[model samples]
Target chain A: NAFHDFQARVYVADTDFSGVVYHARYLEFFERGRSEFLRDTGFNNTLLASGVEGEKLFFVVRHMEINFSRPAQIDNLLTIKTRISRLQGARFFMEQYILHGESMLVTAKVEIALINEEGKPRRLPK
Target chain B: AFHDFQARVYVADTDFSGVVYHARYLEFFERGRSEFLRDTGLLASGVEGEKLFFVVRHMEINFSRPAQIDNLLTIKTRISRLQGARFFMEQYILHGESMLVTAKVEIALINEEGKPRRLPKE
Candidate 1:
């Protein structure tokens, strides 16, 4: 089960001249939600990095499929929900949603891999 | 005839774990480039809204460094080439002495309907 939600305001800078959020800007919002999710789990990327014998380990996006259903306008208060769908050895899958109240505006399934300092795929440190 | 660009790095402008993606930063660099162009000519907001727009045909980027979260960056853009219907821009994203990324973008002026147009005949 996953229970993490983040609220963010869509500022003018987040939107294009059309007053709608840019296509690529959603990825930034996803990052904030993921960061908050990790913090809520009592584990952060910095902690994960330091825990691996001071050898920094980072999560790299292997693949992502994002579906934008509706446009999020400027000044809109949007909520992001992140849930870990599954986890394997060095790979983890997550599903995220951008919602305006109860309506889902965008949904994405992100596949990520843990990588060592050398940028090589590595197992998560236990 | 002018050059000035400003953008703030928000917390959300990072990656899943906090570090910025290698490829995505180029978009940010382009944002800086567009702003600089606007500042130079007093024009921006694209053709759809402004009646005059520039379209990027292609770009080649070289990633030399990775930007982390909360890293406010400054991008320097120079119009290296300007022809009748084609123009080239060389942009560099820098954080002090470290040159994080460099890109060469090819662009063209177009109309709201996406028709190839030249810069307003001055």
Candidate 2:
């Protein structure tokens, strides 16, 4: 649970018309979860920015597919779970899921690629 | 152009990182799609009236660079495919000669029951 778990609260800014969390706002929450996951891993953004790995690398999301289930309302504490499922050459696949307590609110499949400073794809670190 | 629009970045669109938040780009893309439906006179009569709205099924986005606050941006969209009930779009956010973002998006229509439905003739 400690390896890759992140929590986020839905605030008024994420609510529109006072309905459950707005649609697109979930994407932002998903991003924050992923960022935290990477930060905990050795591939921290702070380290990448400083070229701590001998060479700087950029992570860009290449593709995504999300399924929305139950709606989550404002003030609902959400749990975002992220895990690296595969590393295929220059690309990495991840599974990110957001749950409102025991109910799943969102599930996503994401593909990201590592690139050089010049935007060319590069192999991931060993 | 399938659907195009111009937007000015506001403080609400940026974050402490000092650039437009990556997630905000999806909202802008929604604007293009919404306006495209409006311009074609399909949004009201078909989407809303018939209780058939579009849902995003798949997306491929390349964030080449960040767009800063107050940046005068142009969002261009083109319909690349309209097969069965799925609509495919290729979109770009450009600043002068710089292409800031590119996305390949797929959308499908659904009825009030949230089940896939055939799109109305456009």
**Which candidate has the highest DockQ of all?**
2
- Residue-wise C-alpha lDDT for candidate 2, range B1-122, written one tens digit per residue: 54678888899898644567777888888787777777777432544555555667666677777788999888888789999888899988887779888888888866544567776678
Q: For residues B1-122, could you state the per-residue lDDT of candidate 1 as single tens digits? A: 32435455566566554566744765776777768756755244443355555556555555555677767777788788888897878887777678777767777765544467766542
Cα RMSD, model 1: 8.1
Per-residue lDDT of A19-109 in model 1, one digit per residue for the tens?
4776568878987888798788666888767755566777776656566666677788999999889889898888999998888887877
Model 2 CA deviation exceeding 4 Å by range: A1-3, A116-118, B8-21, B41-72, B78-122
For residues A1-126, what per-residue lDDT tens digits would candidate 2 score against the true structure? 333778989899897542467668888888888889887766776676567777767677676666766567779999999988888988998899999888888888888887666666788877
Interface RMSD of each: 7.2, 4.0
| Model 1 ranges off by over 4 Å | A51-54, B1-122
Given candidate 1, what's the lDDT at residue B1?
A: 34
